[PDB]
Design a binder for this molecule. Sequence first.
Ligand code: ANP
Ligand code: ANP
Ligand code: MN
Ligand code: MN
Ligand code: ZN
Lengths: 1009, 285, 154, 304, 173
Amino acid sequence: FLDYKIIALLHDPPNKAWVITGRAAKYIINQLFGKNYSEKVDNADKLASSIDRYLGSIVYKERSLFENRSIFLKNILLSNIQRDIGNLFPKDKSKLDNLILEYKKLLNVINKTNLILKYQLFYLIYELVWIDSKYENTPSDTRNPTHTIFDHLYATAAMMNWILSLEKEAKGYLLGIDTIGVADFISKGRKTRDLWISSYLVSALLWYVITWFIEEYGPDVILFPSLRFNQFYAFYLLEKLRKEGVSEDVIDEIKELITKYIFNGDDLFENLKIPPYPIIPGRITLILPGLIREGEEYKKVQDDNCFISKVKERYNEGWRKLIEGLRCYSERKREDGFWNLVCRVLKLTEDLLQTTPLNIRVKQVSVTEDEIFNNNKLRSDSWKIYDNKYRQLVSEFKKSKLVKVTPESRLKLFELTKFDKLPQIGEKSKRGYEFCTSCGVLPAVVIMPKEDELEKKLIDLGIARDEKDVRSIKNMISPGERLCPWCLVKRALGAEPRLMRILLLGDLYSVEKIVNEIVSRDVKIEIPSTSDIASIKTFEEMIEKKNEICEDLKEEEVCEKPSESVLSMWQWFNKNYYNGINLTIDPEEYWFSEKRRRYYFSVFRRHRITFPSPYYALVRADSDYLGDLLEGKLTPYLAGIIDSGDYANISEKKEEVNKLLEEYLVNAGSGSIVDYVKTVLKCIRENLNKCSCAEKIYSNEVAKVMFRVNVEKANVEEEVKNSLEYFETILNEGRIIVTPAWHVSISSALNRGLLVELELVNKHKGFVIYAGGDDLLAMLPVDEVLDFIKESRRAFAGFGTEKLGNMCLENGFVRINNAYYPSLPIVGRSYSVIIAHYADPLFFVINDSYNLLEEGKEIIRYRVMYNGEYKDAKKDVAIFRYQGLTSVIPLSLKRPIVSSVSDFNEIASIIDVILELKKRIDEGRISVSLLYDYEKYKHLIVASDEKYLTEFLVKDWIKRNSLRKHVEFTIDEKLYGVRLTIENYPIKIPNDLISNIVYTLRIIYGGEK
Amino acid sequence: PYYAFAEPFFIHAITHLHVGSGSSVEEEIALPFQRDELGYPTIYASSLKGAIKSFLLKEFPDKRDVIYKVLGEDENPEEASLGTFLDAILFAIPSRIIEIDSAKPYVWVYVTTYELLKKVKLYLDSISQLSNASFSNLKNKIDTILAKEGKNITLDSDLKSAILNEDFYVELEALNNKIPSIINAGVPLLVLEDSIGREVINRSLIRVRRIRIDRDKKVVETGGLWSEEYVPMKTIFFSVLLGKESKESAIFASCILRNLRYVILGGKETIGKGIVELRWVKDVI
Amino acid sequence: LYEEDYKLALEAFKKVFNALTHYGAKQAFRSRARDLVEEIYNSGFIPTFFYIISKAELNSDSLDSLISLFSSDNAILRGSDENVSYSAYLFIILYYLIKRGIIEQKFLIQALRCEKTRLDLIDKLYNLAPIISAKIRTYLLAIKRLSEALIEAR
Amino acid sequence: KRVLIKPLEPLMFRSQGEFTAAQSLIIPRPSTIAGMLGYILFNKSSGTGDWLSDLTNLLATIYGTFIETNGEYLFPLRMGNHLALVDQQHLINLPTLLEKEYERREKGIYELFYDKNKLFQIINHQDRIGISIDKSTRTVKEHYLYSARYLAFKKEVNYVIFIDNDAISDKINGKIVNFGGENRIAKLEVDDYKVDTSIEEEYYLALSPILIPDEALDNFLDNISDYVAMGKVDKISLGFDIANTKRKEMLTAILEGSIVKRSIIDFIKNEIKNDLRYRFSKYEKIGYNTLMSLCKLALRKILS
Amino acid sequence: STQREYVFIPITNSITIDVKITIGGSDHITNIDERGIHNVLVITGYAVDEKNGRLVPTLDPCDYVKGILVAGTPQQAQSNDFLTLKLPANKLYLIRKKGNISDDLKIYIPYSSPDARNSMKTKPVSISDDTIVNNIIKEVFDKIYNITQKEKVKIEKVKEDIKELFSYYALEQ
Ligand SMILES: Nc1ncnc2c1ncn2[C@@H]1O[C@H](COP(=O)(O)OP(=O)(O)NP(=O)(O)O)[C@@H](O)[C@H]1O
Ligand SMILES: Nc1ncnc2c1ncn2[C@@H]1O[C@H](COP(=O)(O)OP(=O)(O)NP(=O)(O)O)[C@@H](O)[C@H]1O
Ligand SMILES: [Mn+2]
Ligand SMILES: [Mn+2]
Ligand SMILES: [Zn+2]
């Protein structure tokens, strides 16, 4: 039996810091039984986080032996960032049960027959109601703050699944899921509609398979991504209570509570009926209990096929549900155009669409009572199995990864292509069949002509039967296009993006109920194109110069009115649509045309406004070493110096690895413990060896056990030894031993960074194609990339001056209005930018956006500062690329990324120089010839191995082509000797930083003509 | 065999040549020449085929059927072409020379590398066993030359030293034997080591800036500035025409190619670029 | 290819830039660097070399200072800013010829010490003039750009 | 016995549709080699709607393709979306490296695909753009702008195959053939060469695409680890038939350069009834299911 | 510390007198868990000598024989004709790696002199005769692992995995 973690989750309230050592069980619960602790909640605790063996197991459950009167909270990733709690408190007992009355505004109105619904109801709001009560995020432990308290609560409750799985007799599971070809699936597209809906498919398909998990095992079963800040879990809980039965004035205390802390923008989830951003990754892992219910009762089974087959069948069942819903909706709009055709094809090729265009890998490692319990309680090395099992999972995943199967290989296309029994609408191919222009791999089912008449030639072919659907299809399916079954299914899901609710609500409604819910309302969703973006600042201009330049265009429906309710996921579209310039027109006909082009440009010449540039900027961001970050390797710290392969003989980098965790362990504790451990470190080359220094520092232990006595045994005999050999484990085989709490903390940081990243990208004119936090794929205008990257790279660590959506932005922390939350300051993060024409095939653009970053995070090395000497850091590169150029800008120039509060200002400083130079180029101070002249000065500046000489050289190169003979633009000297190594790859990258700055500006100014 | 005979020929640039390629901003030249694979100038087989096809269709408007069915009919694509051109390989590019205390004071020489001669020997080997295409002496000369690879070699044995394209000092040596001249031009041929040869050759190309001027005020129009690469006069390319056995190929090779000496290749012909002389290696050497 | 020549020019410029102790001599050398490469490639290397040595005041003291520059890096050139700048440029050219194997260093140092062999140096340079002019242009232009960038305009 | 196909010029083996430029494969598929050989050996009387029947009649069993650069032999090797050419001396320890430890796995395999990768030393990707001109205007004819990424060779390269029959190996010698896509040329040369056959090792290298009978697709796929240790599985078209001017077929295949486990053999041997057994025996005859041992240069077909 | 030793599975019953060990320590390299064998060693370049079974070191990379390492040393009748070495626990190509290695391990090997008087061309052979290993478990697999008839309820399971996994090379001389 389970579903009762409410006793174990709140085994420590969000007022722990003000309890230990005065500061004047605790509040077990006002609505539930009392919490039970025999071997369930504390055997969960002493195996969930890292403290319970770090500062000693008896010294932890003591929680006052090295006690501190102050409450600090250091960063999980950076021990060297001290954060205080100030003096603000949660309101005292005379007002305490104040907030408890909000624990019964949505928990008692909904009848509690459903325990799972109570958990999932309470699992999302335990965090959000207290940041309304301004509790400032008291850390997990006071004596060793290395996690926020919730990263301990949710962690102990999440591995409570293993606890309960081992409760009965023997079982426990770790489950992982990884979709197989996300990168290539995404590339398959034509319109930026296909891209968004395909990323949303990768997200929502995977979300469906764990909607089952969250309804059957409740929430908190997910390790990654944490569902603490999810644009999907919030939406799902919302529209699930919408089914369970609500009144529009009872639950909005949760609806609008979410509305601000997630979906910071006005274009809400309850105004589109879908989360506007695909945020779910393609890899999600789970921890599982050995028990399973088939209705009202649990029963365990030993077969290791228990969960893999269920995950696979549910994943296929989701695709079945969505294609049947597409069939239903296409039958409903049998006449509304482009849906007669969707119905026709879904009727023709039915057994092809039975298989999902996305495959998944699913691996599973188990655990037994052995190695975790001795007779009926824990044994030694029990904190050493969760990381062990997790490494088993990661190793099995990366073992499988050695084989790539494409989803198209699932289909039975032999007899279809061997004979002319392939159904083809439009041009009956002369060559048996044609390939689709959106995948290139599959045979097409719909073939629209390029043009010879374009009005009857698409009827004489039978792709349409009437003259009215000619426009209806020519709007959605372009000329000369050839679609496969899968490509048409995607383009259909794109013509109407709300069908995905079937795959989104996750076995909660019926397909017919939802298709009938959205078959009544006619909500024209809009999704930008690449031509839309390549004209943003055109639009933005016309908004101000409203009609002073619209006289020839008044009757060209570009200065017309907004129709009814056309609202989009694109936040820029949703605050410029009503101003007076219709944003749903498609510029490929107006100024990006070839007939109406000489006209609109001729109108704009006499009106002296900027001609739109046919260039957008596809921006992709990938983190650096996130995997082994979650697996404990210190490589994301020493990016470039230490690497993944260096972790086959990790003792070999003893000097460079022991230098790091040395200051990461002791600088993580607070109190006398800081002196307790800072002697047991490096205790092999002390003139003192392992287990010999055991009672050589004993004083600080024994001199404290006789300070405050309440436990029966003041005799240690084991407490120094286990702790010292714990640290010996983490440093000899040098890692940070990963625990569930570690995973939950970094995943929560990933989600918070995700939502602030959304806030940043729509703070620009960006259109989020995908944002997993750790990753990103957007489409910004060319003129907003740099400030984005600079912001993004800093925001990812936490840096900058603005309250972003509704949360603060500290140095390594994010504060949600009073509560300091950790971030990823150490985590390097690469970027890639491709200046693309709107007419370039999106396939190649996406593919080399992926390849550039993937191979450049490997090939590129650059001279990095490290302790004074100069290594070759690998990652943290913001790569740029034009039609024939390429550029690399390092982002950190230091290893580790940050260790001081000042170091944050060094983050992404080179691009900042690029900004302060791009400003003065067009401000009329420095010519653009600064970028032609440089080739004259480049050889001397490269060959110059001295600071002041290079200073004078660059200063002369600036002066010689200055427009005002007084400009003082001081390029810093650290940018002078940093070289760029590029081994065995046929690209042409300049091996010096200033040439890369010049090429960056060259690339960006290239996409402005 | 379905490639029964082969016609090796030379491509002498009478004027400068510009067989264009993909114009783009990565090469400090807006309109670059067609690069081969080693950075050398080349003429793609498609460019050769199309240009010579157009020229023949214009000059012999009655043999139009023979030309259509040997070089590929356009309006009735149902039958493969009986004729095929190999990519034209750069055989020698002219270079300005400054003699250094030598016997015959020249002002320009032909410059080759060993990569180019290896490719020429590849073409020549692959067609020598066609029972009519024999030209043993040519590949024998090429092999004598290729033996000496690594050393900057001169064929006419009087230089011993030179400065090429005003910028490259190289020392030359003979071939221990006269090695009768490949072409019948009275200019020495210099086979250079590849590293220095690429520099000499890339410097032998013409890089021109061009502008568009407003007819009225003789000012330059906004944006009318770009660069192009030409291949100089006297440049020699090497290519092969391969033909299947069909009888229209026989009449083509008989009286279409015997009266074929000059041809227009490449683009920009209104600037007088592209006049080319075709020398068949079946009568000369 | 002549890409090591930029490194060569940096070090040769550092030499003559420390050797010229008077700032007016630095500015004189600046004007020399900007005039003499033009003149070398418009009139020929031999005319301009004769012009340089005629203006260099090649007395044994100045020649010893030159040789010390070739070796010491603590040396100092003296003697009438015009003359000292022409001698600094003479050293620029000679330093190139030494570090590029065109002229054997020992033969040069012998020439800058004896007197009969100075004419031998000039004759050898005469026979090497095409090679020298072809090979030294990148180096001399690097010197010109360095002098324009580092020595303040007078 | 052994046939060296020496491309005289950059080649084009069009793959995966035409829709910046269309990309070329590295190693031509066996259908292309079989079609070129049948083009040589053709007689205009054996026509039938089965392209591969008339092709199996024209020749004999052909063994898969690899690279001879300069005496060296290069072989394809893929990890999944990552093709490379390696010399066999680096395939020896590969199975050991396969179920070797994790970080050693990535160290070794990424050292193989990046530094030991001899691809880029051998292959250049040369974009070629062509247009069409109308013979009266002398300006580009409208809509005729095509591009293709040809496969250029930095150093002299040969494609190596092994043919069993020795009768055709006389009228194949020194033939200039129209190998590949847009009218490119290669020379064939025949030489007697010694190659072992049918060794019973555990790990083989797919020198050619191992086809899958579209009946065991679900069976072969849902437990994929049992058959391929590393490589790629993809749906490939079988080319274009000259006789009837159509595409040929589409089949799931194990792309050449994959590492297959011995089990796959028995698997393929158990999932073919007489009909498709004959079909796929023909497929193997023209050269699809060729395996080589990581031990040494020793080939074998799966069925035959 | 610890150490191990090598046993092989030929088509011959030449394993009777090899070592005097059953357990040695308490846990083992190769394990017995209900899905066949685990941590099974593969050594290339050594070919068997069926009659009076030994393994000669050849010069072949694909000449391979599989074996099993368990804690002990043979008979106190060796150190003149065997080999033995102490590897850093990861110089071992062993199939189905399950347990964490001990960062060090000492292992002996049954060695044979090359016998440099014969033109040895080997031949690989597969295991046959389900009975042969069905009672080599009577010979060693129960002698070396008493677990036989006590844990594994599917005997023919391990029988068939020994069928499918193990295949080796012979001197054939
Ligand atoms: N919903 C999504 N939409 C688009 N891209 C995504 C999405 N989720 C993840 N990605 C990206 O897709 C890539 C997945 O990495 P990867 O592990 O290679 O899976 P893959 O791309 O499917 N190939 P594979 O490793 O075999 O699984 C990364 O770039 C992710 O950031
Ligand atoms: N353990 C993991 N948990 C969550 N996501 C993961 C994990 N491992 C990989 N991913 C994601 O899957 C993809 C793996 O591709 P990649 O990003 O190349 O790996 P990586 O760990 O980030 N190494 P790097 O090349 O530095 O990024 C990324 O999108 C990661 O965000
Ligand atoms: Mn994936
Ligand atoms: Mn990553
Ligand atoms: Zn398609």
